[PDB]
Design a protein around this ligand. Structure first.
Ligand SMILES: Nc1ncnc2c1ncn2[C@@H]1O[C@H](COP(=O)(O)OP(=O)(O)O)[C@@H](O)[C@H]1O
Ligand SMILES: [Mg+2]
Ligand SMILES: [Mg+2]
Ligand SMILES: [Mg+2]
Ligand SMILES: [Mg+2]
Lengths: 228, 320, 186, 320, 320, 156
DNA sequence: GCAGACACTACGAGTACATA
DNA sequence: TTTTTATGTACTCGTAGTGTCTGC
């Protein structure tokens, strides 16, 4: 099998979720944070022709950056990984799929509860600002029938009170009150526009980011509030 | 059957580790106190400490989370340094369990000295996240848990059963072993050997199983295997007789014979002289053997140091 | 210093408001002030037979043990806690001493040796050079000083006084005075 | 009612954490010293230290803030490093208040060792920023707070109540426990039980409530549960009783029982004999046990070497 | 041969280290208990401890892995500090053995005191990786292995063969030596010398080979070499004569002579004084030598501690 | 007779070059020649205890007479991490010249050395082909048994 | 293309612990 | 009127020096 700068790209991303990854034969890759805070899944170009466990995902993505695009990835006769570049050959380990934290099946979202979208451009403006503004916690609520995001700094106001930042996401059509609170630490997804499906049942709830390329599902936090 | 098998493993004291809280062999009040919890449906903070290993702590930690359907994160205590708490443990605890499950962090074997600072950072953490998430701690030695942490936890103390519980718990293990035998294909010719395994290393139910593993070499426990478990390799009659007669040439000769396992022989001696000698000579024989035992292993020539015990006895010991 | 009306701000305000953390650093460092060691309150409790005030505190089995070693009258019970000290409750160790050392009094001064650290140097530099230990290194100094005046040996060896070696011998500028002294009168 | 319930949490010693400064059970002078502060309206620099855990320190901090309607930053002491003090702590102090609200910074559990630099750094932060905000510090061991801070701060020591403050404070808590039983739906059949919990744990109100949780398993506090709370600790009673009686058959039998963790058992022995024996027998028990401890691990048979300790004690130890 | 030769080395007690578990000279039940394992085809956790060196532990560790076709990692215990476990050992154990082999980590000579904390981190590790991977530990002194680790392991104890095994095992070694001779070109003129080597230092099969190396100086073992091996001294006459005469200058001089094997010399002394001294001086000589023997190996200067024995004797021993 | 012409101390510049120059008793000289005969050295412990007998000299000699590539180290200096870093850097290394590597440790019967001595148990085995160790002792018992097992113990 | 900015490494100082 | 033993190991903090990724 052969991996493309497009997919080597989508993986450096799943490295910010789990240091390792489980990939089974196919066009589809999933991973989940060890502590279950984040779940990613995607369908890909390059085709995955054998199963394997990768303990180091980000360091092997580092070693595949040193060969040519034409390089042929195969299971090694000796069961590890052989990367054959044209003039060269590299040997990288496999761990057993016990020490890498795989989800079982590709967790399907429920019927959503509310839905909005976000433009690629406006994701940039959030992440990039959070650093400066020290926005470590954000909240999706409604304002004037129009859903806004809100940045806060949780250490400064533990209460999510002085809202340091806000971005209006689109019109809110239905009728419900909600404050969903997401830890900036779980936002691991790559940039671009996402359809946003969030769901809540009492002390239940979750937020799915549906991208063009891969899907992302992020846990809410416990002070999150709503009637649904 | 009623027993759990992990079937993903061969090591047998780990193949049979209990799935639920009912399977665990526990003192009366300790079981009751756990069933109670599994009821309330939410788990408080809990410390489970041995200090004798293999009493079920790390099993019950995993158990409780199962019986409550916890959303659980298991952690090696010694891997649990401070920045671990800060990043992953804190992410986990701040995460909304979205299917409405108790979040529980099991920190196994947390009693290392080095982890003090991590445990300190933890003291304000367990308070901030107490609504969402709770912590179960396992330790061999409590004093390695800073006091402020024992305040915050229900401290349950394993392996100190009452005289009544010991007897009952053992009886429960003999049955539990028997049912393992049925499962593994080991056949029991004499039951006395299953009982003797349980009694021999009691407090610890792990080595109690892995002792059954290694005495099953031949696939049967017969009254022969019983000899090794209880092991008395003994005929001490030759020494006892020479001590009565207060001679040396004979004692001096027997010393190099028992130089082999001194630890065992000293036992079989204290055992059989205790009955055969006078009451105030009993208080002495312990002073005499007890001292000889202490300094063994400092003693250069074991054979000689054994002779010195024989002379010491023949002189002061008295009986008919 | 312009503007000439500035309500002189304290050392700290200047630092913090302007944000140069090395100023903040000299400022904080100002509070360094490090001593503590209430050890003698425990020790004096054991001498003068008074109220314990312990296990709430930090006890050095070695501090105590050693402090008491100053007085020949204690030795029997300091010694006892030596052979037997390891594996006694930090508290047990304190309960024993209290039930052991009978009278009480002590004034401070502990015993230390005289170090001609001229002479300490010459010995460690023989010990290093020849990979022999200290007692032999001694014999060395004597048969050199006695015969061969050992200026030569001091002459050839001076080459390595490596200033790190100096870190082993004494702790201060007296060290930098030796640096010169062995480089001198050979 | 008069009681606070957090209702967002199930862990019950945290469901009932007091809201104001009145709700708290504190010694006379201290409680007043606290009202007096919330009167003059602005909060001075305070350090609150137990060292017994759960005396109200971190609660009394959160309260002073509620009672001043203060703008508060609650920080984990172990999280407060040099860059925090430079960072979001200065960010906070220097940024502006139009609410006319006392700006208070709660540094909870600040007693760690490596924070020496963060501490020296704060003591200066205080001189530059003192007039914007104020700082409340929670600690268990004060010694872990650099001396230059204890200086600039009002230092109030919880946990050491007068003899009358012991008597009233417990009354106040017996009352408080009963009230929690009203809400949680626990029935009190015998009250001597609620007094037992409080006396037994006294300096520490956190475990004091927790123990209310674990003993409500059935849903009533009755005359039988009295017997459990009150019932007399240590299980070294069997050996201590056999040593008094100076017999052997019994001691000889107990030896193989504690052969398991010898290191722990020798501790619990030195601990509990020290009180139960005469003063010059104290000097001997250390010689006897201290030696037995030294040579353990040289000793071949641990069980026997433990017996030799028992005999040695029964002879020389005397007491009533 | 039937014998393994490493051929990459000259040091001969290491050229001949047994390849398989059958080659090893082991007590009846210990062999059986290993063959049993090599069958099940998976290895449990195992501790193999001497404390007499060169009984076959480190050989059997390597053996078992061979007879099972383990995928093995060998490690110096003292190099085995905590961050080693964390990085390499943990990488190894988490690695899928892809050809389907048992993974086994042999931690040789793990009984250092300093490694306690590493062994503690290990207690939760051996449980997490138990399906894939197992640990074999070698130690000279068990007490240097924390109890929770002995719980997790099958603890097999070397060098305490039964009276029966000793005899068998020796017979096996005499054959094993003979076959080494054939291989090295040493010729045996008298067999009595091969038997005497084995008996002389028995428990230890290493110095037993390296004694064969150094008595082969002349390339034949004749009844002359037999003299040196069985030799010892027997010439205790010089000391016995100086003790009668009650002088010092001479005794003080003889001490450094016998400082070499103290254990032997103390034997030959008790043996030959027992006949040459008065009956109530016999009871004392044992007290005197018996004590001197106990504390040897605590004693700093062996030579001096031997002098202190001579003086002690010359004074109290009275006889013609 | 050998002279080391850059040295200033008698005993250090007249130290016997060969296993011959040394003055020893009978089975001593035989047993030494018998050893250098085999051209590779085993592990060895040498002890007097009556000092100034030639312990430390006979070691540097046995090395010489085998054309051993010899690293001399004082015992007092042989700490745990000395062993780890250099002495391992030494015995791990192959030699160009293909000689036997040998490590003399003079007077290893000192005190703190105790934990080091335990490190060697599994070291002296792990490079047992490359190199071997010669240990000097005034008192043997100050050498832990598991070393006495690995070594041939000759007594002067 | 560089220079600037961010992130990750390592060493030094401090601290605490256990065995001799 | 006081005042710090030796040897090994582990965790955390702080800073400074190294890198790579990025922006005129
Ligand atoms: N057997 C010997 N023959 C000749 N010189 C000797 C002998 N033993 C010791 N010496 C003298 O002692 C010096 C070194 O002694 P050394 O081997 O260090 O003794 P030790 O090993 O007992 O410390 C040598 O220079 C040598 O001349
Ligand atoms: Mg466990
Ligand atoms: Mg608190
Ligand atoms: Mg070995
Ligand atoms: Mg020398």
């Amino acid at each position: 099998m052969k991996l493309s700068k497009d997919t080597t790209a989508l993986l450096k991303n799943f490295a910010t979720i789990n240091s390792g990854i489980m990939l089974k034969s196919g066009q589809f890759i999933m991973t989940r944070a060890v502590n279950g805070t984040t779940y990613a899944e995607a369908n890909i170009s390059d085709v995955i022709d054998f199963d394997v466990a990768i303990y180091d995902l980000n360091g092997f993505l580092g070693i595949l950056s040193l060969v040519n695009d034409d390089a042929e990835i195969s299971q090694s006769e000796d069961g590890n990984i052989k990367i054959a570049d044209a003039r060269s050959t590299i040997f990288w380990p496999a761990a057993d799929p016990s020490t890498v934290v795989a989800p079982n099946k590709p967790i399907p979202f429920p019927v959503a509860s509310a839905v909005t979208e976000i433009k690629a451009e406006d994701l940039q403006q959030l992440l990039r600002v959070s650093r400066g503004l020290q926005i470590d916690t954000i909240a999706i609520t409604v304002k004037e029938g129009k859903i806004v995001i809100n940045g806060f700094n949780k250490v400064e106001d533990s209460a999510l009170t002085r809202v340091k930042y806000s971005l209006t996401l689109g019109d809110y059509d239905g009728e419900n009150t909600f404050n969903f609170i997401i830890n900036m630490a779980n936002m691991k997804m790559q940039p671009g526009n996402y359809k946003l499906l969030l769901w809540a049942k009492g002390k239940q709830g979750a937020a799915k980011f549906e991208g063009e390329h891969a899907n992302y599902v992020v846990a809410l936090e416990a002070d999150s509030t709503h009637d649904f | 059957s009623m027993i759990t098998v992990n079937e993903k493993e061969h090591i047998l004291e780990q193949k049979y580790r209990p799935s639920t809280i009912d399977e665990c062999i526990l003192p009366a009040f300790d079981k009751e106190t756990f069933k109670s919890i599994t009821s309330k449906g939410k788990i408080p903070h809990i410390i489970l400490h041995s200090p004798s290993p293999g009493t079920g702590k790390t099993t019950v930690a995993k158990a409780l989370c199962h019986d409550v359907n916890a959303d659980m994160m298991f952690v090696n205590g010694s891997d649990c340094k401070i920045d671990f708490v800060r990043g992953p443990l804190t992410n986990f605890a701040s995460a909304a369990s979205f299917d409405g499950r108790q979040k529980v962090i099991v920190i196994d074997e947390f009693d290392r000295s080095g982890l003090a600072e991590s445990q300190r950072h933890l003291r304000s953490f367990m308070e901030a996240y107490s609504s969402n998430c709770s912590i179960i701690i396992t330790a061999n030695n409590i004093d390695g848990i800073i006091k402020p942490l024992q305040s915050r936890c229900r401290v349950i103390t394993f392996g100190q059963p009452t005289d009544e519980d010991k007897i009952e718990m053992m009886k429960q293990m003999i049955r539990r072993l028997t049912e393992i035998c049925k499962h593994e294909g080991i056949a029991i010719a004499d039951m006395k050997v299953v009982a003797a395994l349980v009694k021999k290393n009691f407090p610890d139910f792990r080595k109690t199983i892995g002792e059954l593993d290694s005495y099953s070499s031949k696939g049967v426990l017969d009254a022969g295997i019983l000899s090794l478990v209880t092991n008395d390799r003994g005929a001490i009659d030759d020494v006892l007789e020479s001590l009565k007669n207060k001679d040396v040439k004979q004692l001096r000769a027997l010393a190099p014979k028992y130089a082999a396992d001194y630890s065992w022989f000293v036992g079989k001696l204290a055992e059989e002289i205790y009955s055969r000698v006078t009451p105030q000579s009993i208080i002495r024989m312990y002073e005499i053997v007890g001292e000889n035992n202490q300094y063994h292993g400092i003693a250069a020539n074991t054979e000689l140091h054994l002779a010195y015990l024989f002379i010491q006895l023949a002189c002061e010991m008295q009986w008919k | 210093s312009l503007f000439k009306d500035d309500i002189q701000l304290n050392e700290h305000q200047v630092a913090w408001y302007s944000k140069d953390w090395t100023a903040v650093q000299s400022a904080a460092d100002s509070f360094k002030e490090k001593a503590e060691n209430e050890f003698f309150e425990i020790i004096g409790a054991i001498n003068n037979k008074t109220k314990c005030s312990i296990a709430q505190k930090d006890y050095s089995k070695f501090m105590v043990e050693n402090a008491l070693s100053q007085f020949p009258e204690c030795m029997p019970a300091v010694y006892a806690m030596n052979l037997i000290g390891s594996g006694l409750s930090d508290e047990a160790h304190f309960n024993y001493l209290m039930a052991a050392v009978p009278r009480g009094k002590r004034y401070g001064k502990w015993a230390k040796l005289v170090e001609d650290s001229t002479e300490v140097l010459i010995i460690k530099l023989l010990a290093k050079r020849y990979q022999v230990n200290t007692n032999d290194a001694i014999n060395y100094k004597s048969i050199l000083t006695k015969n061969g005046k050992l200026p030569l040996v001091l002459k050839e060896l001076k080459g390595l006084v490596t200033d790190d070696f100096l870190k082993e011998v004494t702790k201060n500028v007296k060290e930098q005075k030796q640096l010169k002294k062995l480089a001198l009168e050979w």
